[PDB]
Amino acid sequence: QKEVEQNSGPLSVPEGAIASLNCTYSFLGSQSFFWYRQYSGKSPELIMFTYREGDKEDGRFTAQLNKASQHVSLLIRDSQPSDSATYLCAVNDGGRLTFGDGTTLTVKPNIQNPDPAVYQLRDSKSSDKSVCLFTDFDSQTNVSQSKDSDVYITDKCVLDMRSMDFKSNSAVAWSNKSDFACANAFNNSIIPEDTF
Amino acid sequence: GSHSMRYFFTSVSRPGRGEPRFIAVGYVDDTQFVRFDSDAASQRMEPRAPWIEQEGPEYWDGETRKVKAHSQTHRVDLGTLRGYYNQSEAGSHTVQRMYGCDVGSDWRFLRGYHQYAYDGKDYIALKEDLRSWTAADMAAQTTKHKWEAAHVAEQLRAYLEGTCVEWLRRYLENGKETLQRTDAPKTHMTHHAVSDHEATLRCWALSFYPAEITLTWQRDGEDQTQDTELVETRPAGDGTFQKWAAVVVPSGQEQRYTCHVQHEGLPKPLTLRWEP
Amino acid sequence: SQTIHQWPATLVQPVGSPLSLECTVEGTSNPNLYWYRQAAGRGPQLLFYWGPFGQISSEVPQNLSASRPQDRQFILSSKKLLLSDSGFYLCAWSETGLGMGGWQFGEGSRLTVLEDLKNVFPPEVAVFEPSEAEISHTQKATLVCLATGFYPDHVELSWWVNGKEVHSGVCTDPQPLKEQPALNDSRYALSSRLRVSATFWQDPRNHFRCQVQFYGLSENDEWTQDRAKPVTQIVSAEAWGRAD
Amino acid sequence: MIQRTPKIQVYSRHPAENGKSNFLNCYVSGFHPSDIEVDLLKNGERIEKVEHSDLSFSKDWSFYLLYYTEFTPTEKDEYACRVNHVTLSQPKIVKWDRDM
Amino acid sequence: AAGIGILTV
């Protein structure tokens, strides 16, 4: 993308902070500019547009334009985790929109009362089949893939219990081995489980 | 001195013959520089001046898309305006739109405009400020409220104050051996009569650019409205323009009056008396 | 209340199959209508830009055409699909002319084009029950769901509690894992969690279903395998609320 | 609706010398609608090779077209612009003369 | 040509 450049990301901002996303178009004759948000798996959703120099505020969003440097920005006040999304810049070069490839943003949630624990969950259907669950760590912790094959472990993930005011990080590991231990060696913090 | 950029759009419906006739044309000052003619083969915005050809294909691609989009919107209009005017489908109608921007000699914005006619008369026009709308009559007022709800005026202002001026600046510095170069007029003197002494004479400007040429006839001793009569400045067909002013004099022999010719490309306003 | 829906949502087809996508707009008249295509990692690219009276612009894609039977209905098609035609097909409208009204995309149509339908498997689904430890520690219960061994890579997981769908308390992996990250035609896994009160989980009235919508072959698609054709289907797993 | 009848000048580009190539010009202006019949005549017959300016207009919404052909003028020459429009009750021919 | 403000009547 010569025509419209954004940094890719991923870019982290912390919950509460201002995320600030930039764009540089090269078509001198663009007369209007557009920001889109794109959640994983979904079509882009129009956050806002502008056709003039300066700032446009729509609640938490502010679009900015500088024709002289052919620069466009979005600013997101008080970032929530649910703003994590890919933010796609677009330029109207005449009857149509031309797009950048987006910057992907990650708003790491604020974990107030961390309780880093690893658990064994057993299968509904009567099997020696089980999964390990690293849950309630705070956001400073990052989870690593096992570079042992035939053991899978997923990236970390945020879950609101909307009505218990409580956010939780969580990551899951499993294997289909006869010799799998929930003491699985990657980063750790502290383990509040010792099985039986 | 001053300069301008204007775009002129003309759409003529054809009862039957599916597609109306759309002709779009671009000017800096008195020099056409782009066109589009829906009827022609290329189906693109074409250059009509040496210096716009510099522009790359991305430019042409977007001028093309916008011009076509204009065309399709005048297409809709024609039908909508029929409805507003209780007109039948037979009979051909004309939608016309002109806009642009004037700059003074420092090349800053002076005035921007945006107007729209229907069957040869004013339908709706952006006022001098670039925010209120003069609407001819009832139908025009429905177009007015529509465009007010949509903030058309602020979109046009953004275009007219900024973009239009930015590009006019670019085109003047890009085309500078054409648009800024100033051709003084060549200079004639014609004596007409018939075989009883009855005579008039007219001073000629020829091959001058740009087109405004104020050309007077000095009454030896006067009051400050005086009786010539002149043809309208006409295109030579190449670059230049041409024109003449005629004042009537004694039925025989008089060198009392004289041609005050002031053309921007001319240090000394140009006096001429009659001789062979 | 303008709107724009596109159909179908997700498609898995073999190289050489014909393609048809449909888009409909409502609540505006004579709109500009657009087809865009989006590759992973990239922004939408334009294919077709149509005025209300016909085509204004196309980025001249081999093997693809557009048409517009009604004012508000628009269509993208292909005669024989190439592999390279995999992507995320998106339709948009703008209000007639050159302005700021509109510019909304519909919900998009995801197309995967496979050289070979033998590799197509649906997910095996498994719910794992909360740790009886976790419960005593936190007075909270997490269920995990495990969609496994599916190809191609697109499923849609959901949690159901007493047969109403529920969102509060869920997170699902944003993208899936390669079970064999080595092979380019590896099958995939994907996890999701539902976390509820401990007292909630310990009430046997309560009923938990994990649900995975998989997109697979059309009913009529060519097939040589012993196994039953791996069509579009919902595969679920389930659990019931337990004390000690 | 308004209709506006055309004004017509027929003329030379440069000062027409007798034995020299030049351009014969017919400028129609001020007229509405845009549909207009223009013809350049050599010796009262029409010239087949004739062209025009792309259609533009004025602050009053009037059209102007410049119709031209290249030509060698002939001492005894019978050049003229013939022009019809809806506003004309019959066609209207205008005679060139060098000098006007 | 313009890119913004151009609408049907």
Author numbering:
A (entry chain D): 1 to 196
B (entry chain A): 1 to 276
C (entry chain E): 1 to 244
D (entry chain B): 0 to 99
E (entry chain C): 2 to 10
Which sentences from the paper describe this structure?
The interaction between the clonotypic αβ TCR and peptide–MHC (pMHC) governs T‐cell mediated immunity toward pathogens and cancer, and can lead to acute organ transplant rejection and autoimmune disease. Here, we investigated the Melan‐A (melanoma antigen A)/MART‐1 (melanoma antigen recognized by T‐cells‐1) protein that has been the focus of a number of clinical approaches designed to employ T‐cells for targeting melanoma 16, 17, 18, 19, 20, 21. Our data revealed that recognition of A2‐AAG by MEL5, but not other published TCRs, involved a novel peptide anchor residue switch, enabling the peptide to present a bulged form, anchored with Ala1 of the peptide within the MHC B‐pocket. Finally, we reveal an extended mechanism of flexibility at the TCR–pMHC interface that contributes to our understanding of the molecular rules that govern T‐cell antigen recognition.
To confirm this unusual observation, we investigated the binding mode of a previously published high affinity variant of MEL5, the α24β17 TCR 29. The overall binding mode of the MEL5 and α24β17 TCRs in complex with A2‐AAG was similar to the MEL5‐A2‐EAA complex. This was reflected by similar crossing angles of 48° and 42.3° and buried surface areas (BSAs) of ≈2200 and ≈2600 Å for MEL5 and α24β17 TCRs, respectively, in complex with A2‐AAG, compared to a crossing angle of 46.9° and BSA of 2366 Å for MEL5‐A2‐EAA 28. MEL5 and α24β17 interacted with A2‐AAGbul and A2‐AAGstr in a similar fashion, both focusing on the solvent exposed “GIGI” motif in the center of the peptide and making four hydrogen bonds and multiple van der Waals (vdWs) contacts through TCR residues αGln31 and βLeu98. The main differences in peptide interactions were observed at the N‐terminus of the peptide forms, in which additional contacts were formed between MEL5 αGln31 and Ala2, and α24β17 αGln31 and Ala1. The α24β17 TCR also contacted all three restriction triad residues, but formed several new interactions, primarily with the HLA α1 helix, mediated mainly through residues mutated during the affinity maturation process. These interactions included an extra salt bridge between αAsp93 and αArg65, and three new hydrogen bonds between TCR residues βPro52 and βPhe53, and MHC residue Gln72 compared to the MEL5 TCR. In total, α24β17 made one additional electrostatic interaction and four additional vdWs contacts with the peptide, but three additional electrostatic interactions and 56 additional vdWs contacts with the MHC surface compared to the MEL5 TCR.
